[PDB]
Amino acid sequence: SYQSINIPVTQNMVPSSRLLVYYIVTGEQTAELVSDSVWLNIEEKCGNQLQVHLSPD
């Protein structure tokens, strides 16, 4: 088994992110770069989260 990607999703990711995963395996005498990627859909959370309201209602 291999470790999961456990990293927390960070505020610099909030529009979107892309995960790419790769390894080189060099079986026999020849290397192959092996890779994959997935689109990650992240919430549009603002970093400062400014909110505005009037005091009376």
Added chain:
Amino acid sequence: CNFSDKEVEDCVTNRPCRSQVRCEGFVCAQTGRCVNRRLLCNGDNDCGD
């Protein structure tokens, strides 16, 4: 004189043996030759049997 100027006897050994030389290729079933994986099904007997 006589033939057989050499004796070999069985032993019991606790010592570890690292003789398992790795084969990334295909290990031939009867002969144990390590053929490259590319040589399977090429029409040549690259292993034995």
